[PDB]
Amino acid sequence: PALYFCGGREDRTLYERIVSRLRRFGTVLTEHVAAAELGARGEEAAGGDRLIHEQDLEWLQQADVVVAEVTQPSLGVGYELGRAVAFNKRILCLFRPQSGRVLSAMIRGAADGSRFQVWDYEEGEVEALLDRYFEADPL
Amino acid sequence: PALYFCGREDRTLYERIVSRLRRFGTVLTEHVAAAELGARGEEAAGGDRLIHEQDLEWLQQADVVVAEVTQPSLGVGYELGRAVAFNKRILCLFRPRVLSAMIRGAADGSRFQVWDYEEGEVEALLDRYFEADPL
């Protein structure tokens, strides 16, 4: 199975823990290594940005499931979720209310509670939640 | 024509862009209840589905989608994602915060453009955009 992942210290350690657990269920498609540097270059890196955008789109279409950590506001994560919905992907969004953030009503409103789910979680149970998600509906 | 639009300086600029957009057609935009609905969390999922449906209907009705993308936002990103899949004409305005490489990368320079701007010229830039490709 193929899994697409998109997403301070708490956020980054949870991204690492989610990706590590997703690797138990199939091949994880995720990449963020150049995003900060491409972004810092602005309009001058538009060419490289178009390449990474095409790559993320091909991975979203290949994916059997899209998983997003939606705690921190992000235009990139929101965009990839919009494209994933139009591709009718199975999607799981994970949001941590204890971060102080308010999750966008648009993201909570896009979830139907079946094909697209949004789950609130506490940092300590994210592995157990992913095991629950994939046992109740295996890939 | 129908146009869809998605701190202190940012709020003034959203108001200036919407005011100028009304010269080119009917402007579809709403955020009156978004903060309150969002703060309610899972308890307001029902109301959230209703506003999600309304925004999708407006994105489909729109002849052009305009977004101010200076501040990171999942909702704005999601609406741009849906707009791209609906193959809408899109203009993103960014004020050099650093803009996501994903949004710059989604632009093709034609049907979806990302324009960097300075606060003082935002009205003249909207005039330019609609004179070069009128609605």
Ligand SMILES: CC(C)c1ccc2c(c1)S(=O)(=O)N=C(Nc1ccc(C(=O)O)cc1)N2
């Ligand atoms: C072939 C290389 C190694 C590569 C392939 C794909 C990607 C990258 C590099 S990247 O430049 O590191 N970034 C992404 N995707 C992004 C996802 C989200 C955001 C955001 O939230 O703003 C930004 C970028 N894909």
Ligand SMILES: CC(C)c1ccc2c(c1)S(=O)(=O)N=C(Nc1ccc(C(=O)O)cc1)N2
């Ligand atoms: C007039 C009725 C009550 C109504 C119709 C449509 C909408 C609303 C109210 S609203 O609750 O004010 N918000 C939205 N759209 C949103 C756009 C962006 C975000 C975000 O960035 O998090 C959230 C919501 N549409």
